[PDB]
Symmetry: D2
Subunit: 462 residues, 4 copies
Amino acid sequence: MKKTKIVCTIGPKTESEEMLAKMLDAGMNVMRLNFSHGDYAEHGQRIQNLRNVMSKTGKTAAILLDTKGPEIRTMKLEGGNDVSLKAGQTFTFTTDKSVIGNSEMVAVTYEGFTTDLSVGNTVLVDDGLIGMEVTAIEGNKVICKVLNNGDLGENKGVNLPGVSIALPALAEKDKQDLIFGCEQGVDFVAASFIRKRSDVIEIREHLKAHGGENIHIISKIENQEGLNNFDEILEASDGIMVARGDLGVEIPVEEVIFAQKMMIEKCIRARKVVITATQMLDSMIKNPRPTRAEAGDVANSILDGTDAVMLSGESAKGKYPLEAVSIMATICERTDRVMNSRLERITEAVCRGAVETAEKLDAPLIVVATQGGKSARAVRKYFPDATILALTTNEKTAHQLVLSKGVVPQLVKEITSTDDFYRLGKELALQSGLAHKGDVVVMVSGALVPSGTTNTASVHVL
Amino acid sequence: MKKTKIVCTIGPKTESEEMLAKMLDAGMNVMRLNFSHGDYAEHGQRIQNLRNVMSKTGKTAAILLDTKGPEIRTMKLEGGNDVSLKAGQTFTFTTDKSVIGNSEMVAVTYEGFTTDLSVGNTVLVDDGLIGMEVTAIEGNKVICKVLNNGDLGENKGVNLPGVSIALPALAEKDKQDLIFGCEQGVDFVAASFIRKRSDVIEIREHLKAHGGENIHIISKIENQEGLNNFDEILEASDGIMVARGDLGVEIPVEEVIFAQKMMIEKCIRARKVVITATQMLDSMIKNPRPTRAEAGDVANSILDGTDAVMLSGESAKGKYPLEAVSIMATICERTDRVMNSRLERITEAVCRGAVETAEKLDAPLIVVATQGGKSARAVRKYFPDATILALTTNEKTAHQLVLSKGVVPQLVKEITSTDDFYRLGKELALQSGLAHKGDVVVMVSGALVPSGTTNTASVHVL
Amino acid sequence: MKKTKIVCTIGPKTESEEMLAKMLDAGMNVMRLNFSHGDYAEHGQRIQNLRNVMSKTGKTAAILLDTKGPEIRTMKLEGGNDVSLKAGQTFTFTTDKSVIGNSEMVAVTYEGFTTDLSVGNTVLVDDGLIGMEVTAIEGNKVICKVLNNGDLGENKGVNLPGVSIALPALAEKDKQDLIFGCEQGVDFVAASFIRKRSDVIEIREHLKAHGGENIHIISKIENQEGLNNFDEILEASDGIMVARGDLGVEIPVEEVIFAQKMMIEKCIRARKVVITATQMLDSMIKNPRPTRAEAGDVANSILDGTDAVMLSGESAKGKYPLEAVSIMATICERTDRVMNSRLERITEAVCRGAVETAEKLDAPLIVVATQGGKSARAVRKYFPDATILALTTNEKTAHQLVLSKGVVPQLVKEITSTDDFYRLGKELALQSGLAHKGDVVVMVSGALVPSGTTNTASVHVL
Amino acid sequence: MKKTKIVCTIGPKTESEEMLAKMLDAGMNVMRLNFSHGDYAEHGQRIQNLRNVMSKTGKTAAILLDTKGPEIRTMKLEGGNDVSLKAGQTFTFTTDKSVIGNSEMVAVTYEGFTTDLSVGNTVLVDDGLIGMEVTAIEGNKVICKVLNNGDLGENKGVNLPGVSIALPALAEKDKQDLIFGCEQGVDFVAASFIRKRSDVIEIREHLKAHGGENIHIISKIENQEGLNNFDEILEASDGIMVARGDLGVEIPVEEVIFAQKMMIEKCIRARKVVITATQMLDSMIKNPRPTRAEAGDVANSILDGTDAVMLSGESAKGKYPLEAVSIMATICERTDRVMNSRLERITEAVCRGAVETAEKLDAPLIVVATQGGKSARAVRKYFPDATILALTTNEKTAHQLVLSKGVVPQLVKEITSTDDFYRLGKELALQSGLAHKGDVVVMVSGALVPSGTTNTASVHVL
């Protein structure tokens, strides 16, 4: 019933085949492997468990590897004791990795800390808990004024709002994780902390060098620089993950909502998948139902037009993973059902016209022939009322279309001509149970053209 | 360049192969044979001459047989001299065909004259030259008061505005002429004086009894009864001829223009060809150029949306036939040049969408696969900017489509699948010279459906 | 209840008060005085006769003076009779007026003939019957080649398409006629022989020199130069007369149709009255009913959007003046009945919105306050379904609005404020019989602005 | 600035004249007095402080009294100690108000508890912390099975999802509080727990009986019954308060978002003010910045079209009231900045047209004459880009309009005619600084009609 797709982070509490089967039943479509945690054996077993469930059940799902990414962290403290920092005090960061910290100084993991920052910049420590102002930079030290009281622990994330950070596109561990991704045949790589087009290119070349040229890159937009370069990032990527939580400590709080809406809108126009993620139903880590605010947040992201919504801790380690997935699916179908098409060069003319024709003829189903998935994503751009049945001979395309809104992939032996596509599509339409005898279906394909163009629309009664 | 099609009545001045070739060059598309005059040997030779020119040139034209039709006429006069009738005098019509007339009485050819008229009806004689009011009907006589002075000659047409006249659908000569039409394999029959649906059916049954089931019937609308019954007449016909001159004697003069505009509009909606005829460029019977009034009348009929315009005496017996055709073509091109598409179940959705797609992509050509001509006529309904190349295996369809606005027919060997249609259509598009390498064409056909449906539209770069 | 206004040329057959009263009854709105004929006593009596009728009846009409203007004509020939000219022969025009002509030469009335013409120009003689090309100019001779066979008679009109002639818009006879017009207080001047903007200015300066500053200038577009300069002519004029017959003598016949349509459209956009004239119902000079062609031409001119249609000979010297007016009114009402509003600066925003509001609320009447007439004409531009009741204290404006489509003028003693306008307008609305208790009316005026702007729209229930 | 209006609950932390002045500076428009807490002397001094600031400063604000309302609560426990309830245990509610409760039974304050509930209904206790299922109803006892573990404290709210509760429209304290509201001349009453049209009518009659007929009633929609009867409730009320927090405990969580969006949309169409309230920036009770989720929730409520957003604890008792108002105003301006007009009977035709005219002419200001406020609210319905300057002689209207989106009220001594309105309105437009010389303004009023119809729009250049 629902069209919006659900990404579920799988962890210890949901990794068993029993759980994965019930997760798919409840509406999960894509497994997220979060490589900030776990080791290759845990993630590898999760992949095995899912593909076994898919084989036994005939269910289709996609697998997304989400990188840890490069980051700036504080380091160790004296006797590993927390230190209490006070508004107004001076506090210093050093790039000397040998230093053990105290209430006056701590080391950071990033040698470029002194170069990238300027006097007057803001330094945020521990997911924005403690704010500081840079007052001087001397040698390997960044000297600051603490702006608010807070307890500093060990190895805390550092955020530098509005700063262009010269960290590499990939941490060394990320590069090995991507090779693991290629070994395992993952369908998507979600790359963290993408700031510019060149970051995306480096990831693409790394995957290409290990046989992952057909893996789709989902760039995570987490700070102002990525927002500034969004158009070029999107062009080089296959999709976008809107990381609202990270944006919330990196840009003015009133900008975050319009950053999400703008990024979703541009992804739609580019025919590229977008995932809304972080801080979705987090209260369900501890509670069996979400808050009103969370449900509204999720629903507005769907009304914005997102292809997919993502569960993190709620599904990986929380106490009510199945409840979280089920209420997410309820939110999806309740919100999708009240959304309308948006019908306002060749592919788009044909795909937009195909959706218009389907709407005017009350067709419940658009059947699309596709090799790389573009024709299905081109139809989805207009938010058809009809479900999209996407026929492909490409197993990776079949998996990847699971993430696109309102698309049902079906792997087929092959499609040998335009008329054979019509014959086969009509029977698979009936077999799918998505349409019935007497229903109108619209059938969209590329005839006598290279694989990337969609140029033909045809109307059939089942 | 022009899209509006030209019907030319062929007579002694224009029947030679040499003249016919120059007429086609100047813009003639359809030959009208007016069986009000001539004998079978002359009309047969005209048919042969045109088919010879078509063979010699590779040009395609259609042949239309126009019946004389039933009439009411006055008859003979004393010493075959005209008689002067005076306003206010009594004048009498008799159905006794033996009577030789004079200034007080004349015979009419129609026995039902006394039956169909009522006291107070209007009798018009000789193209409305002389008007009379029925004052009494007794026996075989219709006694009238003459309303205006006029000279009555022999054998003059009679018009009875607003009266339902029980003349047969076909005169006995019409039946014979129609069989000749079937023997010769004409493409159209223009049936005179159609007043009701049953008139069309009688024509259809006659043609079908002599192997003319595939001849298209063009019903001529000439009086109020036909206008009252137009919707049923159009439904039973393949097309309509708007006979403006006859309507001008039969209905209130201010209604004629809107009768024309309404009939053209309804024909367009029905995907049925419409011809505007009579009083077009008649002054060119005697003059080498038309009047301003004539040129404007013609142009407004094209802006009304007519498929075709018709020359009568101007091309059959007039002194300047080639001039008349040439200026008609100049008017057509000049008017077609400034007309726009009209873009406002399955066949129409696909054909309307195909036209909109062509426009949005600046396609100079829509290529249509068609057996009966239906798909080509369905596209033309929306007045495409693009020319229509209609590919058919049916020679009769190829000829009949010559009358539809903006259609270039092309006879082909049969196309056995949709992809074969695209392959061949692209080649014939280039071969036609209507599109060139790099142009976009839209290709419309029926896939996996019976002959009555058009369900597939495809966009290709040549 | 037509909206299109009728201009009737008044002559001996129709100048008496009794005829004029019957003409107004039948639908005449404006009297045209053709100063091509008649003397000041005749025209003066016509003006008095109409003004007596308006006073006696309370009916409102306007008076339009139409100048003869200068002309170039050929002159006399050997003996009384014609000479036949042959295509290809050389033929010469001379500026020596003493010469009696023959098959090789004829004199013309314009001594500047040799100066204004150039080698290669086209000379047309006798309503374009015979065309010639200038091959040489020397002394008192313009040497040409005849382009087509034709018979040249005596004293025939000469046309020089697109050639700038150093003759005034008004000769001395024209200037005196216009002075008479100013003395008599005519409402409109229809100016002959307008070729360019400066011709209009000359008319305006002549009228302003004799107290005619409030007289509206209707520029006649009768030739090629005027068409080329139409935009500047329209801007300087108060309105336009489309003289189809004369324009047809000078430009390609297929262009005349679109010249008419383009000029009417531009006049509408400029909120300036336009009259369609010449060859309207000319056959009714001799016949009590018009031709089908004539009736359709008139109706299409109304659908084009003309404010007014004009009768010439039909009403001035013909046999059936009252019949011509009556059928003209029938054509107007029948065509106006099926026309729709066209809803596509401050005055434009308010007046367009007032019409849209009237349409949305089914108001039968828009009441406008106006001194110069601009607000009523600004509302009429959108072809409201509602009648326009224009209230003015200016008698000249009251007369002039009689020519604007769908406007009923009403002279009132005063309007002292916006609220008093609403009070009075509602009362006069009911008094007019154009609206009734419970009807909605839209009321348009200029508040706290100079007379040139319309800035206020108000909705009232009667 | 912003157009969305801010309601701030004023409490001990923010009641001083100094704090109120800084609140107005930061964007507060309406003071909410929450009569769940405080006494008449505190609220009375709150009113005095604000009115003194308004007088001294010339700043305008409104005062809204928010009732405590009728409630169902549990009562006391043994030794007033919490008791632990276990999933699966039996637990009983009694309507016997003498009973002191324990881990097996507690009293409720509402005698109708046994009557209104049915076997199988859900009872929720303490903001939905503990759910129970009714298994039996016997005498004064509702016997339930506890559905989840939780500690029950003293005097906790009870919610009965989907039940029609026969509590009175007003608690007895509410009736007294409303008399105080009338005594104090408050501008709005927000009435809690409105379930049906008759509840509103009772409130309306109670205000009318104490001189408060001009106080606007804002009905709070908090449960399913009120949602079911919303259309009748809105019709009888002056506005709506969307109590999201309460709805979250009373209806399926996935419905809450659409309940808000639907109620806002219907209020917009009804030209009636709507406030989005509860769970807006609650985290700012303790933190100086809001969460990303909260800012997005607020912004989406503004994009939904709410007139006003409300602060509760954040501004009444929290630690950072000025910060909360300031970031709220920042969110408002940021969101209002990207919203567009919505241009899709007489008042509505004129006001919709006035907004379209203003937009087409780039007018920064629509000036409205209004006595009851309807014309200002009718213009705001279309979300004009322009500010609305509302001129009124009615002091109560001036204050009430402070709550309507994008309206700036201005009290004037009088306006005696339409022309005087234009003159005065133009000067006050300039005086306000909302427009400047050369700007276009649109001026909207009712001319020659009673209060309550807006029928006049006028365009002026300043």
